[PDB]
Amino acid sequence: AELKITQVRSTIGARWKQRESLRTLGLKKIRQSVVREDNAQTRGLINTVHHLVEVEEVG
Amino acid sequence: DVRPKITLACEVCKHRNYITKKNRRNDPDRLEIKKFCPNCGTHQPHKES
Amino acid sequence: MLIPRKVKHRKQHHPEQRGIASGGTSVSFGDYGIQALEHAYITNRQIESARIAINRHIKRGGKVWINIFPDRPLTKKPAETRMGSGKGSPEWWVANVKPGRVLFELSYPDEKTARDALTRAIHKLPIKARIVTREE
Amino acid sequence: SSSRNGRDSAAQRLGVKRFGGQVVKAGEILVRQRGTHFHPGVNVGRGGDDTLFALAPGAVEFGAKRGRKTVNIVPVARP
Amino acid sequence: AKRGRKKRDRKHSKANHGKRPNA
RNA sequence: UUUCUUGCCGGAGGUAGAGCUACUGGAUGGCCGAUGGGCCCCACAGGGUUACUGACGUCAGCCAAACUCCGAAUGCCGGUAAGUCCAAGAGUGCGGCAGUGAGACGGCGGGGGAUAAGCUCCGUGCGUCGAGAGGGAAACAGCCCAGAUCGCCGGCUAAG
RNA sequence: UUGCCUCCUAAAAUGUAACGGAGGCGCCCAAAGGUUCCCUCAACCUGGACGGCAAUCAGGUGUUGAGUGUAAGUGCACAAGGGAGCUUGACUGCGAGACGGACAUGUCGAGCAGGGACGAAAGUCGGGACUAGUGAUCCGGCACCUCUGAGUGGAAGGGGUGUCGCUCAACGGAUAAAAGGUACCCCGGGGAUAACAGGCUGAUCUUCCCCAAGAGUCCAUAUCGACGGGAUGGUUUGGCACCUCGAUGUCGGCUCGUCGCAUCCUGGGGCUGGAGCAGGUCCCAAGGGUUGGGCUGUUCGCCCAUUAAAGCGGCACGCG
RNA sequence: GUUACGGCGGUCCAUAGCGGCAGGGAAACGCCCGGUCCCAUCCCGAACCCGGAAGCUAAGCCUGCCAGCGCCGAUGAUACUACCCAUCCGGGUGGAAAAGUAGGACACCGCCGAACAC
């Protein structure tokens, strides 16, 4: 599958792991979106930064 | 005192080879014991100085 | 009063007032009981007051159990002393009470009198406490 | 009115230094400990102060023998 | 008492989310 | 890319939680049943007699920071896949030239305090301020949103 | 109190502070070190003159208990614990490799000389069950050396090796060598740090409830109310040390106020524990008023004479 | 190839132990008799050696069966907790603890030697 992950919140006040998960996903600014594979690694990154991103399934 | 830092010297090479503690009260007499004299290259009897 | 015969360590850290009671939460001895609903360091003086209130309300008959024991020493430093210079001496004996802990139990033939005595005890106590019963 | 306490020794930085699976060299210290909380297993020696060290190169493994935790070194296949 | 109580309780606002500097 | 993030794999822990008849210090009952005091049979043999001080033991029940038969979650140490792709402005080593070594509050875990302090002392790949403007908190360093390259007679939103 | 060791705090790696909670230290052991071998009771009975909470003892199981140079983690009938022999691993002198921890500290494989045990049997076992039992450098000794030898045929006049000398205990050790007073004080700084005031807190303080036990001649609640519990206020003593130490003047009195109500008159309820009355106790509703003297530093008080009354507090303990 | 026959060795060393009931000696493992023979008692031929089969499976050994004591012990749930949401409460995602009952278990394999029939 494919996940469109959009950063909705900011890294200000976010933990180091959360910021690094965001940049590992490829998100550097609010409202930036990245299309990634719905694999275990992507799901773990999404779980770490879930409060900072909104995830959708790409049809 | 009590346990002085006695010096064990060999009988043959007569070299003060070792230093060790000994309770003078329990062992008042000079501590004669077999030790290794590097000058002699072998174990020789050493006694307290 | 209730004071331990001895304690291995007489200057202990404050009991952690967290979580609900995991043991002693049901009436195991008497017919009625007083279940705590908030955390509090219930002191030996409060225990004495509550048990005397129960005993004087039930007068002649009945049996009272005091499940909690105040074996935790809370220390107090001498009055008008600055911070530091060691820990204070043991001052109060408290039982770390958590919500759901049954503090006192009562057996008495008359239900109304038993409940009134437990109400006396609760009023003496420093926490919210309800009258629970063995019959579940 | 003062406190009789206030003394304490230096932390000795004991514990496991190479955990399970870590490749170590011969003579490498694996566990700094007081006593044998872990016992010397295979290719593992026990130091005078109870320091478990690897006797041979390999990967650190933790096993149990007669109910006693042991530190062993498993030889690593040559590449 | 009143001053500290008010300064402390004003952290219970939607904008502060239950936290303020110096409580 | 050695850094870091995520997944998985291997690993040691004794914390949170409890559990204590698993140890070291406790808790209502009766029990074969300890000194048995006490009636004594009237043995000084020997024995029931225990209204009361109640041994070990036992029965569901309870606590501990310096208790542990147990025992997480995280964290940490490694290995491995990748991800971050005009690299993080990453880690490491060697020379830069430093200042810094008075921190503050807030959230979590604690010590001292009265489990008071806008108190004090610690821990926190916790945050922010320090050194951070902007919006919200009426005003209001540390809270919340959000990190200001500069303009715009533009648009969408964050917390509110 | 200061250095070192152990534990907890310490939040399951390591590390982690406080004038946090507990203790140890800084020795001791030549047989308590090495090696080789071997073991074996914590408590009931029968008892065992004396000799019960104990003998020399004998059996069983207590299943690994039990106890065991000096506090935690370990070590057990696989014994780090308990006995025995050796004759001196008392294993010492030269020590790749690795390592754990700033210097300092700490671990050992392994190779060589010489030995000690065990030997048949193997060829195996580097001070103490382990972490404290210590003090840098300088400067000096003392033994040994294939070093130096201020022109040397040459020697005497320094170094190397191993060892010694510090409660240098303020234990990283400013000197080899050192106590105080200052209100006669001075200067450089600090609100980094105290006294006053302010601020936070509210232990203390102050003013306020109950299942009311009990007192109140009869009766919990007219008046009160123990044992316990919950708060108010910020007028005390404090705690903190946040503004101020390139200055925020203190107590008391005077003068002048202003404010709060937690009431010393004016209105009520209860008691009528006034059966009633004159009176009075208690609890609910600031406009005014709320004296003058003596003794008090007197913040406090007591006293004298009055008063309707001689209120309590805040205002930088209002106001220099 | 087989035996209630043997030793040697076997596991994140009790699911294996303790206890109770029943069974075995051709050869092994034992039991056992006297000190001429190495060796030993901090005394003792009790532990270690000599000659053994006149005699025995009582015990150890091992076999079968008992779940009584001990041991192991789920799933579920809860406690707890990382992160996240949440003004004081609390909640979501993920992970996830002993007791017990349901329960498991009176342990689990290879080398070689003896007789059996081939």
From Swiss-Prot, chain A:
- Pfam families attached to this UniProt entry: Ribosomal_L30
Tell whether Transport is among the UniProt keywords.
no
Q: Does the keyword Ribonucleoprotein apply?
A: yes
Q: Which InterPro entries match?
A: Ribo_uL30_ferredoxin-like_sf (IPR036919), Ribosomal_uL30_bac-type (IPR005996), Ribosomal_uL30_CS (IPR018038), Ribosomal_uL30_ferredoxin-like (IPR016082)
Give the highest taxon in the source lineage.
Bacteria
Could you cite one Gene Ontology molecular function of this protein? structural constituent of ribosome
An individual GO BP term: translation
Q: Which SUPFAM superfamilies match?
A: Ribosomal protein L30p/L7e
What keywords were assigned to this record? Ribonucleoprotein, Ribosomal protein
Q: Which NCBIfam families match?
A: rpmD_bact
Q: Which family is annotated? A: Belongs to the universal ribosomal protein uL30 family.
Protein name per Swiss-Prot or TrEMBL: Large ribosomal subunit protein uL30
Q: Which gene encodes it?
A: rpmD
UniProtKB/Swiss-Prot annotation, chain B:
Give the protein name, as stated in the record. Answer: Large ribosomal subunit protein bL33A
Transmembrane domains' residue ranges: none
Q: Which SUPFAM superfamilies match?
A: Zn-binding ribosomal proteins
Q: Which GO terms describe its molecular function?
A: structural constituent of ribosome
Q: Which gene does this sequence derive from?
A: rpmG1
* Stretch forming the signal peptide: none
- Kindly give the NCBIfam families that the UniProt entry links to this protein: PRK00504.1, PRK00595.1, rpmG_bact
Checking Pfam families in the record gives:
Ribosomal_L33
Q: Name one GO biological process term.
A: translation
InterPro entries listed in its UniProt record: Ribosomal_bL33 (IPR001705), Ribosomal_bL33_CS (IPR018264), Ribosomal_bL33_sf (IPR038584), Ribosomal_zn-bd (IPR011332)
| Family label | Belongs to the bacterial ribosomal protein bL33 family.
Statement: the UniProt record of this protein carries the keyword Disulfide bond: no
Quote the cellular component terms of the Gene Ontology held in the record: cytoplasm; ribonucleoprotein complex; ribosome
Keywords recorded for this protein, A-Z: Ribonucleoprotein, Ribosomal protein
Keyword Ribonucleoprotein appears in the UniProt entry: yes
UniProtKB/Swiss-Prot annotation, chain C:
Give the protein's function: Binds 23S rRNA and is also seen to make contacts with the A and possibly P site tRNAs.
Which family is it part of?
Answer: Belongs to the universal ribosomal protein uL16 family.
Gene Ontology terms, cellular component aspect? cytosolic large ribosomal subunit
Please give the superkingdom of this protein's source: Bacteria
Q: Where is this region: Disordered?
A: 1-24
Q: Which GO terms describe its biological process?
A: translation
Does the keyword tRNA-binding belong to this entry? Answer: yes
The name under which this protein is listed is Large ribosomal subunit protein uL16
Source organism per entry reads Mycolicibacterium smegmatis (strain ATCC 700084 / mc(2)155) (Mycobacterium smegmatis)
PROSITE patterns cross-referenced by the UniProt entry: RIBOSOMAL_L16_1, RIBOSOMAL_L16_2
Query: Any keyword Ribonucleoprotein?
Result: yes
User: Basic residues compositional bias: what residue ranges?
Assistant: 1-13
Q: Which CDD domains match?
A: Ribosomal_L16_L10e
InterPro entries named among the record's database cross-references:
Ribosomal_uL16 (IPR047873), Ribosomal_uL16_bact-type (IPR000114), Ribosomal_uL16_CS (IPR020798), Ribosomal_uL16_dom (IPR016180), Ribosomal_uL16_sf (IPR036920)
Keyword tags: Ribonucleoprotein, Ribosomal protein, RNA-binding, rRNA-binding, tRNA-binding
Q: How does it assemble?
A: Part of the 50S ribosomal subunit.
The entry lists its GO molecular-function terms as: rRNA binding; structural constituent of ribosome; tRNA binding
UniProtKB/Swiss-Prot annotation, chain D:
Pfam families per UniProt = Ribosomal_L27
Supply the SUPFAM superfamilies for this chain: Ribosomal L27 protein-like
What is a biological process (GO) this protein takes part in? translation
Please name the GO terms that the record assigns under molecular function: structural constituent of ribosome
Keywords for this entry? Answer: Ribonucleoprotein, Ribosomal protein
Q: Which GO terms describe its cellular component?
A: cytosolic large ribosomal subunit
Key word Protease present in the record? no
Tell me yes or no: is Ribosomal protein among this UniProt entry's keywords.
Answer: yes
Q: Which NCBIfam families match?
A: L27
Give the family, as the similarity comment puts it: Belongs to the bacterial ribosomal protein bL27 family.
Matches recorded under PANTHER family: LARGE RIBOSOMAL SUBUNIT PROTEIN BL27M, RIBOSOMAL PROTEIN L27
What name has this protein been given in UniProt? Large ribosomal subunit protein bL27
Q: In which organism is this protein found?
A: Mycolicibacterium smegmatis (strain ATCC 700084 / mc(2)155) (Mycobacterium smegmatis)
